[PDB]
Write a protein that binds this DNA or RNA. Structure first.
Lengths: 82, 126, 208, 153, 126, 100, 98
RNA sequence: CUGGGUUUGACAUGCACAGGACGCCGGCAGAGAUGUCGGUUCCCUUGUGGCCUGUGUGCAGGUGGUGCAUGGCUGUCGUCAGCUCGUGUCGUGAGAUGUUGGGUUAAGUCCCGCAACGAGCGCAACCCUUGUCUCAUGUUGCCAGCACGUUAUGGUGGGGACUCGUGAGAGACUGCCGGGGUCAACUCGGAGGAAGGUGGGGAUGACGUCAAGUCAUCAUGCCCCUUAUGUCCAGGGCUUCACACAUGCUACAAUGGCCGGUACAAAGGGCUGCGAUGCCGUGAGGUGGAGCGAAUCCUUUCAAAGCCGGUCUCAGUUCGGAUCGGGGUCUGCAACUCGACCCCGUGAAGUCGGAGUCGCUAGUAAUCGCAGAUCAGCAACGCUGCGGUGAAUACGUUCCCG
């Protein structure tokens, strides 16, 4: 994982997006493209449309998944079996 | 004084022989602190045994390169050369024993395409 | 892959390096500017037979010596060719770049010139047997040449099948290290493709 | 070996026992080039045998060798496009080699919790003629005798 | 018998046909087959009169049997490969029925390489 | 290889010398000492705003003429294919075939 | 005060020629020398694959060998110095003056 | 691959019209490409040159196709000893002879014969390294004899003595002796020598074969795309897994595991790199920077197997380490897909492996560690080298392969 001195990494785009999103206490779906951004306690209620490679899958954040990345919740490869 | 050298597969031995007792001085350590292996000691003292001049030469030696076995072999060649320098007329006895011959056996160079000098990669026909 | 390049086989024994300088930090850029110089001289001059190009460097000044069979063609009577090459060698960031144009004593005894002539004849209309025979006879007519082998391969005569042909005269001991074999390779531009011509010339041996 | 026999390696006499055969034994028990460990194992086994019997270890070791040394051994021979088990006389050097190899292996499959004790026990039982190497010599002699019909070629 | 087919490019149905045709050769082999591989390739150049190339490899109890054929389509290549493999397996048999005519016979009539040499007395017959 | 990619490698190098020389190095000096106040400084965030091409981590040692991206040698800046051909022609001073 | 004269060249005969010519000129100017003390040869080895494609098992080895000679003088009279900076040498050999 | 842009284009050079800016430096929007806004603005010299703008126009650009159109490079039979030519002779001719026969050799190597006489490419030699010695040679390398040393040692003044480093040279040539030999090649043994019979190992690969491999190092004929198969960007993929094959590493243990002490290498690398002493962590590591372009400093003064001592006592174990949970370090804009390493915990299969099959003849196999290239980091157990310890066996060509 990322070293502690650098702190968590979040892209500026969705950062400013969630800051303007929570300033008026209304949480609409946010369409995003940085799967590498960590979950911050400022996302607890916001619903992210994180990219997959083809489309965007809704991700509704909770307290449990804080500290992970938006990428773990958009599974890329699809496998159904042989 | 007299000084000769012995070389055995990357081990170099400088020997300084004086006519004292059978004290073995190898870089300030004795024959027991050094070379703690009886076979190595016998290999060391074989020229003295065949020349029967055991315990009448104080030996000072400089050791560098190689491992214990190579150092022992180079040291034995060194005492053989020193003895041939001290008393020439014993050359038959040492030479027929082979102690006057430098051993030209070195690590074979590793070759490309082979894992080792001669070991070849496993080949599957199927 | 049958035969190694004869020049590289005897690089430290008989033949000599074509570039002479020393660099420790600036080896890479020295090589870059050297290959730029060589390619620029290659494209710029093609009428006169360019046999060899030497490069010498010492700090700011750069000394380039080249051998041609027709020095007058590459040199300007008022220096026009000299002016052009000097200016476009300054453009190569060589700082002070200085040239010695030279001329080879025996054009037919030099492998590169022989290959260039054979390929030039091959390009327009000439049958390859004529070219090889003429080159071989002209080379053996020279006094110091002890043996020449000429070989070019490709779609010879515009045929659909690639072929390899070669003739030899005298002695060509490629395996002998002290023997000096002058090696020349140059590619013939034909309407049906590319024909590559190799020439080996053996002139005695040098014992150092 | 297509162009003739190859020369043999003249290995040296042992320093602390002065016999050729103990050196042959240490080279037989040698693994991965760890010669020091091999000599330690062999010397420990010889000293254990000396302690148990009370006499020289070399003499009892030689007795074990003669007890396990084979004389008739069987090799497959193809004569006239057919293969059979033909009993063949064994040269002294090969008999010694086979005896030592049998001793070392059958000691390696003993159950005395340590290689030194296994080897000492195997040499002692071969000296008294009860070891598994002695048995193996019995079976190889039995097989050589049972195929005596093919000894003519 | 199980066969794995490693085709390339475009050869629809070639894998199944090759599998079914080759798997029928197990009974012809007189020893168990440990592995069996088939490869189908096509020549890119339209100038080739027989573009499709089929290769096979069978491990007949350690004995390697292989063949290679050319055809104008997958079916013809597979069939010719089957024919060649059958011929090779016939020539490999090595069981007794396949080597009964080569074993030396009679006592003095006929000679072969492995024929039993005649026994000769020490003295000339006279 | 491809002319566009040969060129783009050079463009990265001129970008690197322009930016990584001081801009993308002072921020690293800020982040090194835990004593230095990095968190409010946003030296991480400021250095994110810089172009990716500033970072030398995006560079690629290609053959100086050929453009070959693999089998490169740092001593000569040349591909393994080109080094073999020019050494054989006696173009690199003090280079020859080996034996030992 | 003495200064170190350091030679590094890829060619043995060239650096030996320069060393002897340099001791000749400094002895002409009347200076005490130590002689061309030999130094260990530096060997840089590279291994390359012959073929452009595949065929990894076939490799070709190259080296570059650098020879070093050490020249040390004494009594640095200005005439020897002025001679030292007025020497022409083959481009292959470099000189380090310290 | 999905999506977002772009077209004389991401990049060249030439014909034109208009210029004084191109170009940067910051703001905003955007995932970015990019777009927009704010600030700075060419030197020639009167004809225009350098820059770009657009408008264009030739054109660029293709890791697009065909290695059965090719060059170049390479593998392979095979480092096997063979492949040919000139003249002559025989035959209607394809062709033969020479190149076959006897002997001999690693060898078409050589000798004797011979309708053949010679020659060329091959063999061998010339090149490198290694094993012995002589002369030269003393720093950053040695230190035997001398002095200063303080524990820290060639550390220091000094010295060529011995190594060592690198230059030159000598030395193996059946040179000599004895015996077989056609008195010929050649062969067996002995002396001398460091080395004896191409000393050991390299580099070197004949004519050709297999339309062998490579239009993806590069070049290239022909065909095809050209508002795209060119070109820019973000994300993803090349890491997907019911299986099959192949090359390796680690094991299944006592010839061993763990703990403590302790001895010996070679080779190589290092400038925006190696990085020491010290301090802080348990440990990856962090801070810090001595000295080094390096026979000097750093890679520790360099190793591990080894030796000594203690413990474990034959068990799925103090074996084995996979898998998994938690916690961290470093590189990098960024370790989710998808890095390495560290700590604690977890503790799978595995009891020496069927048919079958592989490598190796001596410093070899086996085993142990070290280094380098690529490289910000690493999937490295891979590859290329280096040294340490170091065996067994070869009766002999009937069988298998070439």
């Amino acid at each position: 994982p990322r070293s502690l001195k650098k702190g968590p990494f979040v892209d500026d785009h969705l950062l400013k997006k969630v800051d303007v999103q929570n300033e008026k206490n209304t949480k609409q779906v946010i369409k995003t493209w940085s799967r590498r951004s960590t979950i911050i306690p400022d996302f607890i209620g916001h619903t992210f449309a994180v990219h997959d490679g083809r489309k965007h899958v809704p991700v509704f954040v909770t307290e449990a998944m804080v500290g992970h990345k938006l990428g773990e919740f958009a599974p890329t490869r699809t496998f159904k079996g042989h | 004084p007299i000084q000769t050298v012995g070389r055995r597969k990357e081990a170099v031995v400088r020997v300084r022989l004086v006519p004292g007792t059978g004290q073995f001085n190898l870089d300030g350590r004795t024959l027991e602190n050094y070379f703690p292996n009886k076979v190595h000691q016998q290999l060391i003292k074989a020229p003295l045994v065949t020349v029967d001049r055991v315990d009448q030469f104080d030996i000072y030696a400089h050791l560098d390169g190689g491992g214990p076995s190579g150092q022992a072999g180079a040291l034995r060649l060194a005492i053989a050369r020193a003895l041939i320098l001290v008393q020439p007329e014993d050359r038959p006895a040492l030479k027929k024993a082979g102690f006057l011959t430098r051993d030209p056996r070195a690590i074979e160079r590793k070759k490309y395409g082979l894992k080792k000098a001669r070991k070849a990669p496993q080949y599957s026909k199927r | 892959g049958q035969k190694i390049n004869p020049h590289g086989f005897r690089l430290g024994i008989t033949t000599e390096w074509k570039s002479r300088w020393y660099a420790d930090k600036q080896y890479k850029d020295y090589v870059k500017e050297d290959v730029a110089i060589r390619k620029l001289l290659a494209t710029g001059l093609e009428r006169a037979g360019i046999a060899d190009v030497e490069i010498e460097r010492t700090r700011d000044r750069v000394r380039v010596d080249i051998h041609t069979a027709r020095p007058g063609i590459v040199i300007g009577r008022r220096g026009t060719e000299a002016d052009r090459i000097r200016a476009d060698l300054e453009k190569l960031t060589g700082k002070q770049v200085q040239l010695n144009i030279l001329e080879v004593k025996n054009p037919e005894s030099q492998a590169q010139l022989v290959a260039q002539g054979v390929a030039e004849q091959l390009s327009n209309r000439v049958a390859f047997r004529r070219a090889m025979r003429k080159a071989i006879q002209s080379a053996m007519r020279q006094p110091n040449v002890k043996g020449i082998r000429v070989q070019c391969s490709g779609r010879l005569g515009g045929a659909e099948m690639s072929r390899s042909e070669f003739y030899r005269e005298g002695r060509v001991p490629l395996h002998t290290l002290r023997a000096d074999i002058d090696y020349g390779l140059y590619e013939a531009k034909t309407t049906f493709g590319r024909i590559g011509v190799k020439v080996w010339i053996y002139k005695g041996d040098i014992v150092g | 070996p297509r162009k003739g026999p190859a020369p043999k390696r003249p290995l040296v006499n042992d320093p602390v026992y002065g016999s050729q055969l103990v050196t042959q034994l240490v080279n037989k028990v040698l693994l991965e080039g760890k010669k020091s460990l091999a000599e330690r194992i062999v010397y420990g086994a010889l000293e254990q045998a000396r302690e148990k019997t009370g006499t020289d270890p070399v003499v009892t070791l030689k007795r074990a060798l003669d007890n396990v040394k084979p004389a008739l051994e069987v090799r497959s021979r193809r004569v006239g496009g057919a293969t059979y088990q033909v009993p063949v006389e064994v040269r002294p050097d090969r008999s010694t080699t086979l005896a030592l190899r049998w001793l070392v292996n059958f000691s390696r499959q003993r159950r005395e919790k340590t290689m030194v004790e296994r080897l000492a026990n195997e040499i002692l039982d071969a000296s008294n003629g009860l070891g598994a190497s002695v048995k193996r010599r019995e079976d190889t002699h039995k097989m050589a005798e049972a195929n005596r019909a093919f000894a003519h070629y | 018998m199980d066969v794995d087919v490693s085709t390339d490019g475009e050869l629809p149905g070639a894998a199944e046909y090759a599998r079914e045709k080759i798997g029928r050769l197990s009974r012809r082999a007189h020893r168990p087959v440990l592995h069996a591989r088939v490869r189908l390739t096509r020549h890119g150049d339209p100038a080739v009169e027989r573009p499709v190339i089929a290769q096979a490899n069978l491990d007949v109890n350690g004995r390697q049997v292989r063949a290679q054929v050319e055809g104008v389509n997958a079916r013809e290549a597979v069939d010719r490969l089957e024919a060649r493999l059958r011929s090779r397996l016939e020539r490999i048999a090595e069981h007794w029925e396949a080597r009964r005519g080569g074993v030396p016979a009679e006592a003095g009539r006929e000679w072969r390489h492995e024929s039993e040499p005649a026994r000769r007395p020490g003295y000339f017959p006279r | 290889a491809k002319k566009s990619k040969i060129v783009k490698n050079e463009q990265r190098r001129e970008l690197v010398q322009r930016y990584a020389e001081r801009r993308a190095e002072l921020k690293r000096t800020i982040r090194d000492p835990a004593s230095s106040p990095e968190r409010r400084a946003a030296a991480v965030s400021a250095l994110q705003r810089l172009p990716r091409d500033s970072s030398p981590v995006r560079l690629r040692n290609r053959d100086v003429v050929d453009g070959r991206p693999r089998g490169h040698l740092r001593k000569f800046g040349l591909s393994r294919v080109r080094v073999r051909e020019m050494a054989h022609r006696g173009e690199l001073p003090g280079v020859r075939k080996a034996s030992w | 005060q003495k200064i170190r004269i350091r030679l590094k060249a890829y060619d043995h005969e060239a650096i030996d020629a320069s060393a002897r010519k340099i001791v000749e000129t400094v002895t002409r100017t009347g200076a005490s020398v130590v002689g061309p003390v030999p130094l260990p040869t530096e060997k840089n080895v590279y291994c390359v694959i012959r073929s452009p494609h595949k065929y990894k098992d076939s490799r070709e080895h190259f080296e570059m060998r650098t020879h070093k000679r050490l020249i040390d003088i004494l009594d640095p009279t200005p005439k020897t110095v002025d001679a030292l900076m007025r020497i022409d040498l083959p481009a292959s050999v470099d000189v380090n003056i310290q």
